[PDB]
């Protein structure tokens, strides 16, 4: 809804009334297998939610699925209304940002991905460029050794004042087939593709939780994802209200 006292919150959180359209389009390359990923659906920042289907249009995705899920849009996380003045994300927004991180898969290789989140028209657009290096052939990335699904997880979020973005490290657990566990270690940054004013955010984390599922009429290689993430960790206003 529209409805804040302060208009810069009104301005970004218009933007994210009802469900928005989503394109995703990721051209990469890793260890030279080259792929291209696309992906459509629909996101409702109301609930935190996004429906996503993601395709690889080169043929067979040459890393798992699940290591892509946190690159393949954080302007849907549902913020509190006690939080509206700490969204980056929409107070971007349309002019849009920069996504850079790098993930450093434990005992493997790591990629390294750039992407810009903004709107084209109705139609927000996720496109990124990822480049994978130094990866181990019979690893369990480009092995194939790990499982279909994906771990909830909380994520930190910090402002970079000297950058006028924020900046985020966090790891991720994938699960591999034997029961153990791959860890992917991320870096993230963002910043804002336009020059105009951004809300820079007191610290406070993301909740996410993810479910990837399959299409049982669709013969190319591709991830169905359910997400939800919802933002957390500033309590309520002067104090607690109910006490």
């Given at each position: 809804?529209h409805h804040?006292?302060d208009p810069?919150?009104?301005?970004g959180?218009?933007?994210?009334?009802?469900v928005?359209?989503?394109?995703?389009?990721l051209?990469?390359?890793?260890?030279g297998h080259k792929?291209?990923?696309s992906?459509?659906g629909?996101?409702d920042?109301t609930?935190?939610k996004?429906t996503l289907?993601?395709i690889?249009t080169?043929?067979?995705?040459?890393?798992?699925?699940p290591?892509?899920?946190?690159?393949?849009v954080?302007c849907?996380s549902r913020?509190?209304?006690?939080?509206k003045?700490?969204d980056?994300?929409?107070?971007?927004m349309?002019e849009?940002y920069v996504q850079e991180?790098t993930?450093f898969?434990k005992?493997d290789?790591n990629y390294?991905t750039r992407?810009?989140?903004?709107?084209?028209?109705?139609?927000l657009?996720?496109?990124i460029?990822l480049?994978g290096?130094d990866?181990?052939?019979?690893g369990?990335i480009?092995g194939?050794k790990?499982?279909?699904?994906y771990?909830?997880?909380?994520?930190?979020?910090?402002?970079?004042?000297?950058?006028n973005g924020?900046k985020?490290?966090?790891k991720?657990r994938?699960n591999?087939?034997?029961?153990?566990?791959?860890l992917?270690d991320?870096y993230?940054?963002?910043?804002?593709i336009?020059d105009?004013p951004?809300?820079?955010?007191?610290?406070?984390?993301?909740?996410?939780?993810s479910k990837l599922?399959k299409?049982?009429?669709?013969?190319?290689?591709?991830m169905?994802?359910?997400?939800?993430?919802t933002?957390?960790?500033?309590?309520?206003?002067?104090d607690?209200?109910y006490k």
């Amino acid at each position: 809804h529209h409805h804040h006292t302060d208009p810069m919150v009104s301005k970004g959180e218009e933007l994210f009334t009802g469900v928005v359209p989503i394109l995703v389009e990721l051209d990469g390359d890793v260890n030279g297998h080259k792929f291209s990923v696309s992906g459509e659906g629909e996101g409702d920042a109301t609930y935190g939610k996004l429906t996503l289907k993601f395709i690889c249009t080169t043929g067979k995705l040459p890393v798992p699925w699940p290591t892509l899920v946190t690159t393949l849009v954080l302007c849907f996380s549902r913020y509190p209304d006690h939080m509206k003045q700490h969204d980056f994300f929409k107070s971007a927004m349309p002019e849009g940002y920069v996504q850079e991180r790098t993930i450093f898969f434990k005992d493997d290789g790591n990629y390294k991905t750039r992407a810009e989140v903004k709107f084209e028209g109705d139609t927000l657009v996720n496109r990124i460029e990822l480049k994978g290096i130094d990866f181990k052939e019979d690893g369990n990335i480009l092995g194939h050794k790990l499982e279909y699904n994906y771990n909830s997880h909380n994520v930190y979020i910090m402002a970079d004042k000297q950058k006028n973005g924020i900046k985020s490290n966090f790891k991720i657990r994938h699960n591999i087939e034997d029961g153990s566990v791959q860890l992917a270690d991320h870096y993230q940054q963002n910043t804002p593709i336009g020059d105009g004013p951004v809300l820079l955010p007191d610290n406070h984390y993301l909740s996410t939780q993810s479910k990837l599922s399959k299409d049982p009429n669709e013969k190319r290689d591709h991830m169905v994802l359910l997400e939800f993430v919802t933002a957390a960790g500033i309590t309520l206003g002067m104090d607690e209200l109910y006490k």
